[PDB]
Design a protein around this nucleic acid. Structure first.
Lengths: 105, 97, 84, 93, 92, 104, 78, 98
DNA sequence: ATCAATATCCACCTGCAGATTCTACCAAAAGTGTATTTGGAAACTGCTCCATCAAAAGGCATGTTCAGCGGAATTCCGCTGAACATGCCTTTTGATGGAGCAGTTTCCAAATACACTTTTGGTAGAATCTGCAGGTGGATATTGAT
DNA sequence: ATCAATATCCACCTGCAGATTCTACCAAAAGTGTATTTGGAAACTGCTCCATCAAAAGGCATGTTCAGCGGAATTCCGCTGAACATGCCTTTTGATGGAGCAGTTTCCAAATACACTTTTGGTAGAATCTGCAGGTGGATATTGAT
């Protein structure tokens, strides 16, 4: 039997997602495409960030992603920074940044 | 004896702190403060170690994020020393009052 | 027990400096530290009020990290990392 | 139980960066992320459906949803990936 | 077709407070928007509350706690009053 | 009706109908529509009172948006409950920074 | 068009805002913002429009927009 | 010939406008600006006049409230004349930007 | 202190846009009465993790001295915005075809609902494994005195 | 511009905790397959209400003048940062008793599902109506030149 996920060509569980859509009433009914498309976006978004993070780690000669990395990947990316502009990543610190005038001469 | 000019260490300290992620507030003390404040509301309460932690990550995260806006205000006033009125303009604008 | 008192002074001047640094702040007034503690107290007050409410609606006596999380999300300070 | 998206993340993790690992915390944070994003699109969807006296949420709402929530390139790509996945699924049985 | 609205109930509540006061049209609209807003807001948090607790029913319980979470101090106070009060009157 | 039983001017029946039809939860207690009815009406009078005043203290007997704005932005609590809301045709409270006043 | 949003106009606004003195540069700044505002809002309303398979944007479409922009507005729909 | 000193009329304009509610921008010019910004997301559209009013009521409001946090920023800098830098400063803190 | 050019009020007036009162209208609520169903409170308790106590230890808070340089205050100029009278370009006000917003009937593709079958992924947890924290010496800066 | 006092940068080395690798078990899941229901797209049809033409209204662009605000420069008092000494208390490793969270079987008070039936709130076409905004006056206060 072909899990809808494979039928859809995804790694994220389409079954889980359609399921959650239900036990969390967002609407009366839920079309079979709905979860497919959603798990799709979810998978895309997470890949996008893991990419950026993976690299973060690489730059810090680290081979395991930690929070900071996730923080870096997010704040350095104009578009993911606005998507999480109100989200706070525990243990992520802040981007090194010192205002001009403060520097010595 | 040798000594650094005023401003030199502070900077070393920003480069440092902006580079790490460990919490900055003593742990045990904070916990207490949370337990006090909670008690004003309820009593005979308990706390998941992690709940206290979640609260710390948030508080520092908020205070840190705040000082930046503050530090901007000061600068906007041709200053480099954050004063209460900077912390206040920030919140007045931020919309926290 | 121990009449928990004045713990808002547990937030040392040092600590409030360390935070200002990560905040990218070079020089600090003498009045900041207290003003700061003032700001901190309110922050917790609002977050704990809400948090404890959820804890009470659940008929529990132990404040779960989840409580703090919903409490946080409610005020638009969403936190990732603690079972959110 | 108390499910998570951990394995699914890990797979994708292994897809993009083959020799890189993730710390239990970082995963905590990715899980939060996922759930969070899930909850919003669904939300936006839910309302969008109501506003239009529609009782069903179809891939159609989930789409507009994504266009309303995500910015610039992220949405443009998201939409793609989403439409893609659907049709591929739609054309099989 | 038809378009419901709280307007009618608003007017009622008006004269029980200012027997001799009229209300602008644009004004009545704003009063409506107001109502719907608040409605959606309480209804909303209440929804969440239930879900959090793996419950499947929104009850006065939720509406209340909800109201505590949504409304400002004193305001929240009376709000709960009128609240429990209407439910007492209704049951008995 | 349930509204008269609850001694409320607000439509308990309708509030009930909107709750279920608002996909908020699977089921819905019978006291919830009542309670919420109760609190909707309550806040409703609270504004009307102040705004009614506003009309009076303006020498007018007809409430317009201005009055509603003047009633919310002048009350500490209501203003906080609507800090993110905009009332069409309401203007602002008369306010001018001290320093901007003509030095005497 | 944008220039259609005149100085006297922007003048008045700042007045209601309580402003006494106004730098000449303030105008080209104001407009740029006024534009950024409308773009973000109009964008979301039109999206709500397309979705309803409609060729005219309805006040509700706007209100809904404003709503998710965190700029709720009363007077044009519940 | 009698003149009014710098700031006196302005000051009474502050008074005038905080009393009224009237929209301060000319309808048409505005409407025109709306459609145009809009015509970049879809085309051959139409607008309920009622939707243009919302949009205008809304923007004016925002701007006004913005000129408030800005005028505060100017004063914070011990001035009385609002400048871009002040608008920028507010918007930056408002998180509306960075 | 003295006018005098003007802006701001107050009291009264009247037309008219727009709130209000009249009544038939009736679909769609809202309420009632019956029958069935199920969410979750109660009672028993298995067991996780919270409050707590002991205790050794050094990271880090506290408190002082000493002076570098930042904030505040004062002065002063030129340069930019405010006030204003002037000429008219255009936004605002009102009349009339027509394009989409909707009200309504239609019917089928699709989403329940439900009895079964089976592949999955939390996980209790014994064994195995491995990136990196934290100690350490040493070569390359970065500062601040002269 | 030489320089010694220090913090920084770094590639090594490696013990320990936290990440990885599983045999072992499965209750909750996700899939399969008719059976049964219907949400809403699709097409035809007004009837609003919106884009557009056009005329008499009334706010903006423009320039000359100078009042007064912002920015530069100069000055100095003492606030606030760096370095140092003393020692308190937070952190770190264990461990114990028992609060209270969470899991399970149980069964009834309240919620759901029609079916029926009386009722009320939303047009709407028609009429009637009135709070108040414009609009004249002339009384008086504010502002500004002297």
């Amino acid at each position: 039997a072909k899990t809808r996920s494979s039928r859809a060509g995804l790694q994220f569980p389409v079954g889980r997602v359609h399921r959650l859509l239900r036990k969390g009433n967002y609407a009366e009914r839920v079309g079979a495409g709905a979860p497919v498309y959603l798990a799709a976006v979810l998978e895309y978004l997470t890949a996008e960030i893991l990419e950026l993070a993976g690299n973060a780690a690489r730059d810090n000669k680290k081979t395991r992603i930690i929070p900071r990395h996730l923080q870096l990947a997010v704040r350095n990316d104009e578009e993911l920074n606005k998507l999480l502009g109100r989200v706070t990543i525990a243990q992520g610190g802040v981007l090194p940044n010192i205002q001009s005038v403060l520097l010595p001469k | 004896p040798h000594r650094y000019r005023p401003g030199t260490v502070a900077l070393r300290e920003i480069r440092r702190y902006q580079k790490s992620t460990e919490l900055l507030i003593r742990k045990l003390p904070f916990q207490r403060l949370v337990r006090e404040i909670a008690q004003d509301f309820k009593t005979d309460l308990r706390f998941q170690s992690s709940a206290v932690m979640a609260l710390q990550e948030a508080s520092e995260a908020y205070l840190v994020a705040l000082f930046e806006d503050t530090n901007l205000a000061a600068i906007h006033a041709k200053r480099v020393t954050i004063m209460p009125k900077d912390i206040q303009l920030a919140r007045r604008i931020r919309g926290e009052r | 027990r121990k009449v928990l008192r004045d713990n808002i002074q547990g937030i040392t001047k040092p600590a409030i400096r360390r935070l200002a640094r990560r905040g990218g702040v070079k020089r600090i007034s003498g009045l900041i530290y207290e003003e700061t503690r003032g700001v901190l107290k309110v922050f917790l007050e609002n977050v704990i009020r809400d948090a404890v409410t959820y804890t009470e609606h659940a008929k529990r006596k132990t404040v779960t990290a989840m409580d703090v999380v919903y409490a946080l999300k409610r005020q638009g300070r969403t936190l990732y990392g603690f079972g959110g | 139980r108390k499910e998570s998206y951990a394995i699914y993340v890990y797979k994708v993790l292994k897809q993009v960066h083959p020799d890189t690992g993730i710390s239990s915390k970082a995963m905590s944070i990715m899980n939060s992320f996922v759930n969070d994003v899930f909850e919003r699109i669904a939300g936006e969807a839910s309302r969008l459906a109501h506003y239009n006296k529609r009782s069903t949420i179809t891939s159609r709402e989930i789409q507009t949803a994504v266009r309303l929530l995500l910015p610039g390139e992220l949405a443009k790509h998201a939409v793609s990936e989403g439409t893609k996945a659907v049709t591929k699924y739609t054309s099989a049985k």
